[PDB]
Each structure stands twice: as C-alpha cells, then as structure tokens.
Amino acid sequence: TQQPIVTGTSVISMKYDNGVIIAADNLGSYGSLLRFNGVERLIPVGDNTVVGISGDISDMQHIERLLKDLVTENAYDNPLADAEEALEPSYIFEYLATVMYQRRSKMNPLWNAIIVAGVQSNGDQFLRYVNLLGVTYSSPTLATGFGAHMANPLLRKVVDRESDIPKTTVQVAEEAIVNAMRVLYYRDARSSRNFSLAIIDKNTGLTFKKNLQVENMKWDFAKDIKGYGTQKI
C-alpha cells in the first residue's frame, strides 16, 4: 500500500479505420509542482504496439523496463521473433493486466493506469485499458484521468459505436486527438502544452511524433472579462 509521488495526467486514444492513435503530454508533476517537462509517457514495444502510462512515474519506469525484458526474453531461442512469434499487442496487454491484478492482490499496487494500443498481426486494431486495480475494458475510445471526463465526450462524437470505425479516417482521428489535447490543456491543472502522439496503422506501421505543441488556442476574449460581478472597469 503506497501513495504516488511524481505523476503523469491523462493518456487518451481511439481507433480509426486502419489502426489506433494514442497521445500523452510530456510532464511529471510533483503534487501541485509541475516538476519535469521531458517525460515520455508513451512506451513503444516493437512496431505494432505503443503503451501509454499515467499515474506514478517511478512505477511507470519499472513497468517500462519490464517491457524491455519482455522483448529480450521473447527473442531468446526464437528465430521467429521478427515475424509470426514477434510480440503481439494482446500478449503485452495480458501480461501487464496479470501483473496489475497481482500487485493489487498483494495490497501493493503498481500505482498506474495503462492503455495498450496497437495493431495485431491479422490486422485487427487493439485498444485496451488496465489500471492499478487490474480492472480492464475496451471501447472505440479510451482515456485515463481528466481525459476520461473531457476527452472521451469529444472523441465519442467521432467514434460513437463500433460501426463508426471503418468510417473514420486517420486525418479525422488525428484531428480529434489534437483538439482533445488542447481542451485538456485549457482545463486540466496538472497538464502540459508539450505532448507526444503515436499512430499505429495497419499499412504505415508505427509513426511516433514527439515534441508536439498545443496550437490554435482562443485566449483573446479574456480582455473583455472584468471583475466577478458588478465591476465595469
């Protein structure tokens, strides 16, 4: 039983016609202190899988190296680690899920919320979520923290049911994610302007964009806001 120290806010993501997108800002907060601005919280495993982690950052780093060990060990005595017996998004998920529920069951959680995103070998999109309780679920859109409350409603306006997915393009998908990241920056007090975004497409493979900034913000109307009621100047 612990309490988180250095933290990362929302991870948000959805799936479109050909694959998935997942985004996360580059910040580790220390309570109210915005302490670290270089934090990469999207962990790519292979080239069919990105793993976005929110929650305690020491526990994330631990999980992060578990993933490397998992790639090293897969490739032991395996002449097919670069095809057919390469790591699959669902394998990486079931493992994490297993560890999460086990740590919860030991009363010593890995204080995180994880979203596993990628494309399976057959071509199917993978998108699933596990958290520090070992609770798991899938939806065409997924998000942790504030993202759950503010990002999901925006994203569900694009992909509101499974039948909407083959209709949604990468441009449309990528659009939504970026707007959502901006809304989060407007309204989440533990968030950051700088963020990373990854697209895993069944035909373009893994595309990983670092050092993105929130752009196109509306702030102008702030000049007209005076007082909190009766003040005119």
């Binding site: 190296r65 090293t72 490739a75 032991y76 005595d77 002449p79």
Partner: protein
C-alpha cells in the same frame, strides 16, 4: 590406492580432478564449433550433423543469444549447454537490473566461469 575418479570433487594424488577430465571427453565427442574475433565484432559458427533426411532445415538452432548482445555456442552434451546459457541469461538480467548497463563480456565470462567451477567443488 585406486578409485580417485569415482567422485567429483576428489584430488587424485597428482592433484587432478578426473571427473572433470572425463567431462572433457564428452566435449571432444561433440560436433565442432568456433568463434572468430574480428576488428569490430565476433563470428560464431557450428557444425550441425544431419543424421537423416528426416531432420528439418534449418530448424534445430544451436547458437544461443544471451541478453541482446552476447552469442554463445557449445560442443558436447547439448542439454548441459542450454542449462549453462539459462544461467547466463538470469545472470545478465540480474546485472542489467541493478547496474542498468548491459553486462560487459568479461563480467559475463566470469559469471559462467564461477558457476562452472562451482560444479567441480562437491
């Protein structure tokens, strides 16, 4: 008298360990394998005896990888060689886990060396 070669950790009267020397005979009965150290790396090659046409090519892999940067190959009793690699793997993980840097080759050599030596002690 006689019988110095029956138990593993016994010094013969000339100071030798016959069980080790017998093990060496099992190596010699093995297929041949080599390593060539070049100017920026190492090559490993091995002889795979094709007993029959029933074998599958090239589906009986003998060379093993430890961590991500170490190749191992061995001659002799094969299951013994896998057991040793297994131990090398745990050892290299344990090293990375604590020290972050992947195990340097001499460090790694000593890891197997101390462990092989250990089996000539009891």
């Amino acid at each position: 008298g006689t019988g110095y070669d029956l138990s593993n950790s016994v010094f013969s009267p000339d100071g030798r360990n016959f069980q080790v020397e017998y093990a060496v005979k099992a190596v010699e009965n093995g297929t041949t394998s080599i390593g060539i150290k070049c100017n920026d790396g190492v090559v490993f090659a091995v002889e795979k005896l094709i007993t029959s046409k029933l074998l599958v090519p090239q589906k009986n892999v003998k060379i093993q990888v430890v961590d991500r940067h170490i190749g191992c190959v061995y001659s002799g009793l094969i299951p013994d060689g896998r057991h040793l690699v297994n131990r090398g793997r745990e050892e290299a993980a344990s090293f990375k886990k604590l020290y972050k840097t992947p195990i340097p080759i001499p460090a790694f050599a000593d890891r197997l060396g101390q462990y092989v030596q250990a089996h000539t002690l009891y």
